[PDB]
mmCIF file of C-alpha atoms in Angstrom:
data_model
loop_
_atom_site.group_PDB
_atom_site.id
_atom_site.type_symbol
_atom_site.label_atom_id
_atom_site.label_comp_id
_atom_site.label_asym_id
_atom_site.label_seq_id
_atom_site.Cartn_x
_atom_site.Cartn_y
_atom_site.Cartn_z
ATOM 1 C CA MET Q 1 -20.071 7.013 11.163
ATOM 2 C CA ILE Q 2 -17.590 4.685 9.257
ATOM 3 C CA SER Q 3 -17.870 6.553 5.693
ATOM 4 C CA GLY Q 4 -16.070 4.511 3.282
ATOM 5 C CA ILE Q 5 -16.241 4.750 -0.708
ATOM 6 C CA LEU Q 6 -17.635 1.903 -0.976
ATOM 7 C CA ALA Q 7 -16.292 -0.792 -3.878
ATOM 8 C CA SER Q 8 -19.508 -3.481 -4.258
ATOM 9 C CA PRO Q 9 -23.223 -3.555 -2.710
ATOM 10 C CA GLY Q 10 -24.208 -6.202 -0.176
ATOM 11 C CA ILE Q 11 -24.809 -6.989 3.291
ATOM 12 C CA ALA Q 12 -22.731 -9.428 5.300
ATOM 13 C CA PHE Q 13 -22.263 -10.857 8.980
ATOM 14 C CA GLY Q 14 -19.044 -11.850 10.733
ATOM 15 C CA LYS Q 15 -16.035 -11.957 12.787
ATOM 16 C CA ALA Q 16 -13.217 -9.108 12.503
ATOM 17 C CA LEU Q 17 -9.513 -10.331 11.199
ATOM 18 C CA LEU Q 18 -7.441 -7.971 12.020
ATOM 19 C CA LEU Q 19 -3.934 -8.648 10.582
ATOM 20 C CA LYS Q 20 -1.027 -7.046 12.744
ATOM 21 C CA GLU Q 21 1.894 -7.581 11.855
ATOM 22 C CA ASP Q 22 4.966 -7.992 13.854
ATOM 23 C CA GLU Q 23 8.361 -4.587 13.145
ATOM 24 C CA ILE Q 24 10.787 -6.722 12.101
ATOM 25 C CA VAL Q 25 14.252 -5.687 14.504
ATOM 26 C CA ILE Q 26 17.813 -5.821 12.487
ATOM 27 C CA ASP Q 27 20.978 -5.948 14.222
ATOM 28 C CA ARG Q 28 23.733 -3.281 13.777
ATOM 29 C CA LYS Q 29 26.276 -6.369 15.493
ATOM 30 C CA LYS Q 30 29.809 -6.090 13.615
ATOM 31 C CA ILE Q 31 30.331 -10.750 13.368
ATOM 32 C CA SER Q 32 33.824 -12.346 12.888
ATOM 33 C CA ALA Q 33 35.398 -13.886 10.642
ATOM 34 C CA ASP Q 34 33.897 -16.932 11.921
ATOM 35 C CA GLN Q 35 30.441 -15.644 10.874
ATOM 36 C CA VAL Q 36 30.904 -14.433 8.228
ATOM 37 C CA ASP Q 37 30.303 -18.276 6.201
ATOM 38 C CA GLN Q 38 26.795 -18.374 8.206
ATOM 39 C CA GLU Q 39 25.965 -15.808 6.818
ATOM 40 C CA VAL Q 40 25.744 -16.962 3.382
ATOM 41 C CA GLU Q 41 24.816 -20.379 4.020
ATOM 42 C CA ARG Q 42 22.267 -17.923 5.547
ATOM 43 C CA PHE Q 43 21.390 -16.234 2.836
ATOM 44 C CA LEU Q 44 22.310 -18.959 0.046
ATOM 45 C CA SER Q 45 20.603 -21.098 1.630
ATOM 46 C CA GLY Q 46 17.757 -18.635 2.801
ATOM 47 C CA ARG Q 47 17.334 -17.868 -0.466
ATOM 48 C CA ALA Q 48 17.095 -21.620 -1.528
ATOM 49 C CA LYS Q 49 13.034 -21.499 1.100
ATOM 50 C CA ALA Q 50 12.562 -17.020 -0.795
ATOM 51 C CA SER Q 51 12.801 -18.791 -3.952
ATOM 52 C CA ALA Q 52 10.949 -21.765 -3.145
ATOM 53 C CA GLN Q 53 7.415 -19.155 -1.634
ATOM 54 C CA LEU Q 54 7.812 -16.701 -4.121
ATOM 55 C CA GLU Q 55 7.234 -19.846 -6.968
ATOM 56 C CA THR Q 56 4.662 -21.764 -4.694
ATOM 57 C CA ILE Q 57 2.630 -17.722 -4.929
ATOM 58 C CA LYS Q 58 3.227 -17.286 -7.820
ATOM 59 C CA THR Q 59 1.354 -20.096 -9.392
ATOM 60 C CA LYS Q 60 -0.969 -19.397 -6.824
ATOM 61 C CA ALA Q 61 -1.670 -16.072 -8.577
ATOM 62 C CA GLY Q 62 -2.096 -17.799 -12.374
ATOM 63 C CA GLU Q 63 -4.369 -20.181 -10.233
ATOM 64 C CA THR Q 64 -5.909 -18.197 -8.351
ATOM 65 C CA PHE Q 65 -7.042 -15.163 -10.966
ATOM 66 C CA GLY Q 66 -5.101 -17.095 -13.499
ATOM 67 C CA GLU Q 67 -2.344 -16.687 -16.776
ATOM 68 C CA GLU Q 68 -1.774 -13.377 -16.910
ATOM 69 C CA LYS Q 69 -0.563 -11.860 -13.076
ATOM 70 C CA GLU Q 70 3.141 -15.102 -13.628
ATOM 71 C CA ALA Q 71 3.919 -12.377 -15.302
ATOM 72 C CA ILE Q 72 4.010 -9.573 -12.640
ATOM 73 C CA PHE Q 73 5.557 -12.168 -10.094
ATOM 74 C CA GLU Q 74 7.863 -14.487 -12.248
ATOM 75 C CA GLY Q 75 9.551 -10.999 -12.244
ATOM 76 C CA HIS Q 76 9.456 -10.466 -8.604
ATOM 77 C CA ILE Q 77 11.291 -13.331 -9.162
ATOM 78 C CA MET Q 78 14.200 -12.581 -11.577
ATOM 79 C CA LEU Q 79 15.334 -9.005 -9.025
ATOM 80 C CA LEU Q 80 15.875 -11.349 -5.934
ATOM 81 C CA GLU Q 81 17.908 -13.902 -8.117
ATOM 82 C CA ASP Q 82 19.518 -11.374 -9.276
ATOM 83 C CA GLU Q 83 23.522 -12.216 -10.716
ATOM 84 C CA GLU Q 84 24.322 -8.746 -9.541
ATOM 85 C CA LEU Q 85 22.171 -7.696 -6.494
ATOM 86 C CA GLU Q 86 23.532 -11.272 -4.834
ATOM 87 C CA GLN Q 87 27.544 -10.100 -5.643
ATOM 88 C CA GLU Q 88 26.445 -6.593 -3.988
ATOM 89 C CA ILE Q 89 24.997 -8.592 -1.409
ATOM 90 C CA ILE Q 90 27.532 -11.094 -0.418
ATOM 91 C CA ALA Q 91 31.013 -8.212 -1.532
ATOM 92 C CA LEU Q 92 28.807 -6.726 1.496
ATOM 93 C CA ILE Q 93 28.578 -9.073 4.723
ATOM 94 C CA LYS Q 94 32.019 -9.944 3.581
ATOM 95 C CA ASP Q 95 32.952 -7.090 3.087
ATOM 96 C CA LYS Q 96 31.207 -4.622 5.486
ATOM 97 C CA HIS Q 97 31.215 -6.694 8.595
ATOM 98 C CA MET Q 98 27.647 -6.812 7.409
ATOM 99 C CA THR Q 99 24.760 -9.158 8.634
ATOM 100 C CA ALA Q 100 22.642 -10.639 5.589
ATOM 101 C CA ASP Q 101 19.796 -9.110 7.677
ATOM 102 C CA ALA Q 102 21.225 -5.751 7.396
ATOM 103 C CA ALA Q 103 23.870 -6.534 4.220
ATOM 104 C CA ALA Q 104 20.369 -7.517 2.946
ATOM 105 C CA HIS Q 105 18.960 -4.271 3.863
ATOM 106 C CA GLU Q 106 20.970 -1.683 2.602
ATOM 107 C CA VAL Q 107 20.801 -2.899 -1.493
ATOM 108 C CA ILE Q 108 16.289 -3.439 -0.358
ATOM 109 C CA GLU Q 109 16.552 0.406 1.180
ATOM 110 C CA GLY Q 110 18.317 2.332 -2.528
ATOM 111 C CA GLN Q 111 15.848 0.372 -4.606
ATOM 112 C CA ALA Q 112 13.160 1.798 -3.316
ATOM 113 C CA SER Q 113 14.553 5.316 -1.910
ATOM 114 C CA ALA Q 114 15.844 5.963 -5.097
ATOM 115 C CA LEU Q 115 12.864 4.399 -7.540
ATOM 116 C CA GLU Q 116 10.841 7.250 -4.983
ATOM 117 C CA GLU Q 117 13.238 9.563 -6.700
ATOM 118 C CA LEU Q 118 11.648 9.003 -10.513
ATOM 119 C CA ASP Q 119 8.609 11.443 -11.758
ATOM 120 C CA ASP Q 120 6.468 8.661 -12.434
ATOM 121 C CA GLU Q 121 3.449 7.214 -10.449
ATOM 122 C CA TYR Q 122 4.515 3.880 -12.143
ATOM 123 C CA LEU Q 123 8.318 3.066 -11.247
ATOM 124 C CA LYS Q 124 6.927 4.841 -7.292
ATOM 125 C CA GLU Q 125 3.590 2.103 -6.870
ATOM 126 C CA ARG Q 126 6.761 -0.372 -7.602
ATOM 127 C CA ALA Q 127 8.999 0.767 -4.339
ATOM 128 C CA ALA Q 128 6.388 -0.194 -2.776
ATOM 129 C CA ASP Q 129 5.983 -3.471 -4.456
ATOM 130 C CA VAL Q 130 10.210 -4.002 -4.754
ATOM 131 C CA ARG Q 131 10.178 -3.123 -0.448
ATOM 132 C CA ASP Q 132 7.505 -6.159 0.056
ATOM 133 C CA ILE Q 133 10.151 -8.534 -2.223
ATOM 134 C CA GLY Q 134 12.557 -7.140 0.567
ATOM 135 C CA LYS Q 135 10.005 -7.834 3.618
ATOM 136 C CA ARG Q 136 9.369 -11.500 2.579
ATOM 137 C CA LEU Q 137 13.138 -12.168 2.110
ATOM 138 C CA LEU Q 138 13.893 -10.678 6.108
ATOM 139 C CA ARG Q 139 11.144 -12.822 7.357
ATOM 140 C CA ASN Q 140 13.161 -15.771 5.907
ATOM 141 C CA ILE Q 141 16.619 -14.972 7.206
ATOM 142 C CA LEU Q 142 14.851 -14.482 10.180
ATOM 143 C CA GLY Q 143 13.098 -17.748 10.313
ATOM 144 C CA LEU Q 144 10.599 -15.288 11.701
ATOM 145 C CA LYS Q 145 7.002 -15.955 11.192
ATOM 146 C CA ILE Q 146 5.050 -16.052 8.124
ATOM 147 C CA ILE Q 147 0.780 -15.156 8.126
ATOM 148 C CA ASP Q 148 -0.838 -18.412 6.312
ATOM 149 C CA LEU Q 149 -3.768 -16.125 5.840
ATOM 150 C CA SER Q 150 -4.729 -19.433 2.471
ATOM 151 C CA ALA Q 151 -5.299 -21.291 5.849
ATOM 152 C CA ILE Q 152 -8.469 -20.227 7.069
ATOM 153 C CA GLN Q 153 -11.161 -22.636 8.272
ATOM 154 C CA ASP Q 154 -13.501 -20.421 9.401
ATOM 155 C CA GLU Q 155 -15.597 -17.389 7.844
ATOM 156 C CA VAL Q 156 -14.940 -14.028 9.383
ATOM 157 C CA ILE Q 157 -14.036 -10.826 7.590
ATOM 158 C CA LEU Q 158 -10.805 -9.181 5.928
ATOM 159 C CA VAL Q 159 -9.569 -6.710 8.006
ATOM 160 C CA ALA Q 160 -6.898 -4.819 7.016
ATOM 161 C CA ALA Q 161 -4.675 -1.551 6.750
ATOM 162 C CA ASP Q 162 -4.107 -2.337 3.194
ATOM 163 C CA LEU Q 163 -2.970 -5.434 1.367
ATOM 164 C CA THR Q 164 -0.411 -5.910 -1.649
ATOM 165 C CA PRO Q 165 -0.287 -8.394 -4.997
ATOM 166 C CA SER Q 166 0.850 -11.257 -2.843
ATOM 167 C CA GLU Q 167 -1.484 -11.969 -0.159
ATOM 168 C CA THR Q 168 -4.378 -10.882 -2.779
ATOM 169 C CA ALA Q 169 -2.819 -14.135 -4.914
ATOM 170 C CA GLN Q 170 -2.478 -16.111 -1.822
ATOM 171 C CA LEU Q 171 -5.614 -14.828 -0.419
ATOM 172 C CA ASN Q 172 -8.707 -17.915 -0.016
ATOM 173 C CA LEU Q 173 -11.826 -16.522 -1.964
ATOM 174 C CA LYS Q 174 -13.811 -19.612 -0.843
ATOM 175 C CA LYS Q 175 -13.715 -18.792 3.610
ATOM 176 C CA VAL Q 176 -13.233 -15.471 3.403
ATOM 177 C CA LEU Q 177 -16.898 -13.054 3.344
ATOM 178 C CA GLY Q 178 -15.464 -9.206 2.627
ATOM 179 C CA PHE Q 179 -12.753 -6.779 2.389
ATOM 180 C CA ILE Q 180 -12.017 -3.694 4.299
ATOM 181 C CA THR Q 181 -9.491 -1.585 4.075
ATOM 182 C CA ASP Q 182 -8.566 1.814 4.581
ATOM 183 C CA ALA Q 183 -6.898 2.085 1.485
ATOM 184 C CA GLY Q 184 -7.788 5.333 -1.155
ATOM 185 C CA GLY Q 185 -9.116 2.864 -2.885
ATOM 186 C CA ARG Q 186 -8.987 5.312 -6.208
ATOM 187 C CA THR Q 187 -6.753 2.176 -8.263
ATOM 188 C CA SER Q 188 -6.549 0.095 -4.888
ATOM 189 C CA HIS Q 189 -5.953 -3.797 -6.208
ATOM 190 C CA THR Q 190 -8.618 -3.905 -3.394
ATOM 191 C CA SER Q 191 -10.891 -2.422 -5.503
ATOM 192 C CA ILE Q 192 -10.305 -4.285 -8.629
ATOM 193 C CA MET Q 193 -11.336 -7.545 -6.627
ATOM 194 C CA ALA Q 194 -14.307 -6.628 -5.242
ATOM 195 C CA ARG Q 195 -14.743 -5.139 -8.689
ATOM 196 C CA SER Q 196 -14.655 -8.173 -10.824
ATOM 197 C CA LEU Q 197 -15.841 -10.566 -8.528
ATOM 198 C CA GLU Q 198 -18.708 -8.086 -7.478
ATOM 199 C CA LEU Q 199 -17.970 -9.009 -3.830
ATOM 200 C CA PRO Q 200 -19.791 -6.767 -1.517
ATOM 201 C CA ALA Q 201 -16.196 -4.434 -0.561
ATOM 202 C CA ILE Q 202 -15.101 -0.943 0.949
ATOM 203 C CA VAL Q 203 -11.480 0.859 1.142
ATOM 204 C CA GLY Q 204 -11.805 4.356 2.293
ATOM 205 C CA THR Q 205 -12.466 3.225 5.999
ATOM 206 C CA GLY Q 206 -9.337 5.254 6.792
ATOM 207 C CA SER Q 207 -9.078 4.201 10.973
ATOM 208 C CA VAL Q 208 -11.442 1.170 11.571
ATOM 209 C CA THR Q 209 -8.690 -0.509 12.129
ATOM 210 C CA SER Q 210 -7.322 1.807 14.419
ATOM 211 C CA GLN Q 211 -11.960 1.514 15.958
ATOM 212 C CA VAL Q 212 -11.495 -2.223 15.592
ATOM 213 C CA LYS Q 213 -9.860 -5.428 16.879
ATOM 214 C CA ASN Q 214 -9.778 -9.103 15.516
ATOM 215 C CA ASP Q 215 -12.367 -11.765 17.262
ATOM 216 C CA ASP Q 216 -14.761 -8.006 17.189
ATOM 217 C CA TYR Q 217 -18.166 -8.813 15.939
ATOM 218 C CA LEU Q 218 -19.154 -6.605 12.935
ATOM 219 C CA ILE Q 219 -21.333 -6.409 10.376
ATOM 220 C CA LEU Q 220 -20.757 -5.200 6.759
ATOM 221 C CA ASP Q 221 -24.178 -3.351 5.821
ATOM 222 C CA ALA Q 222 -22.438 -1.740 1.915
ATOM 223 C CA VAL Q 223 -26.034 -0.066 1.729
ATOM 224 C CA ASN Q 224 -25.674 3.079 3.414
ATOM 225 C CA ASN Q 225 -21.734 2.187 2.860
ATOM 226 C CA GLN Q 226 -21.363 2.388 6.672
ATOM 227 C CA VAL Q 227 -20.104 -0.174 8.900
ATOM 228 C CA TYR Q 228 -21.265 -1.445 12.449
ATOM 229 C CA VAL Q 229 -19.228 -2.348 15.662
ATOM 230 C CA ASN Q 230 -21.671 -4.934 18.405
ATOM 231 C CA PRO Q 231 -24.870 -4.068 17.349
ATOM 232 C CA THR Q 232 -27.423 -4.259 20.426
ATOM 233 C CA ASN Q 233 -29.835 -7.291 18.872
ATOM 234 C CA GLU Q 234 -32.922 -4.915 18.471
ATOM 235 C CA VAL Q 235 -30.906 -4.336 15.517
ATOM 236 C CA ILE Q 236 -29.587 -7.310 14.419
ATOM 237 C CA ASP Q 237 -32.734 -9.190 14.570
ATOM 238 C CA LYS Q 238 -34.993 -6.747 13.514
ATOM 239 C CA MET Q 239 -31.910 -6.230 10.054
ATOM 240 C CA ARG Q 240 -31.687 -10.103 9.597
ATOM 241 C CA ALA Q 241 -35.629 -10.301 8.700
ATOM 242 C CA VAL Q 242 -35.466 -7.220 6.110
ATOM 243 C CA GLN Q 243 -31.792 -8.065 5.585
ATOM 244 C CA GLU Q 244 -32.329 -11.151 4.447
ATOM 245 C CA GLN Q 245 -35.658 -9.735 2.681
ATOM 246 C CA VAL Q 246 -33.488 -7.665 0.582
ATOM 247 C CA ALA Q 247 -31.558 -10.913 -0.828
ATOM 248 C CA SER Q 248 -35.697 -12.539 -0.986
ATOM 249 C CA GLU Q 249 -36.123 -9.535 -2.473
ATOM 250 C CA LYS Q 250 -33.534 -9.700 -4.707
ATOM 251 C CA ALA Q 251 -34.538 -14.216 -5.351
ATOM 252 C CA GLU Q 252 -37.148 -11.414 -6.825
ATOM 253 C CA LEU Q 253 -35.026 -11.044 -9.318
ATOM 254 C CA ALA Q 254 -35.560 -14.747 -9.527
ATOM 255 C CA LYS Q 255 -38.875 -14.440 -10.191
ATOM 256 C CA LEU Q 256 -38.209 -12.378 -12.991
ATOM 257 C CA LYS Q 257 -40.599 -14.938 -14.773
ATOM 258 C CA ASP Q 258 -44.191 -13.393 -13.584
ATOM 259 C CA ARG Q 259 -42.074 -10.560 -16.078
#
């Protein structure tokens, strides 16, 4: 009964790939002047990584969708390498004895919160794009593990509460079989992918992430706008024939030569 908004029609079979995230724990402990010097190297040299990460993703955005998307990630690096937000972070770590994780979170706490005080969905939706830049920066300071979605080797379905341009900029469109997310969809960056690529997808799933686990066997219908979870062979075998009869009845468009 999973009623979504249906992005594009089509039918695909594959295992559920649930993208879960480990909650990050920030340490609010005060360090000693003997560990402050290390925070700067962890942050200074750390930025060497975050700068290299987004940079590497920046080229994937231009080599995957094309140039016009590089300008968006190009400014996202300027904000991260901002010499101004740099002096403020440093000072805090040294003046408030804050950890690069805590101090870095403070600045990012006002950049996102301050944009929420604006009355414009454009600068606001930027708040979500800005927080995403801090999240990665945090996982880099703690060297936390990063989810490598651009390294899939088995064809499966993609399930997630929602995906940000970055994830979509590095996603692999050669091993993915479809995109399923519970995001309103009105103007969800996901839909724009499913629409320009005409591939089949759904976005208003709502709580499928609370009904499916990863590895779960699913079947996307994108015809009746419905997803089947753990279906009996009777329904699979029965659809496999009719279903493929559609792709073949579609290849009947290849037969659009009789006319």
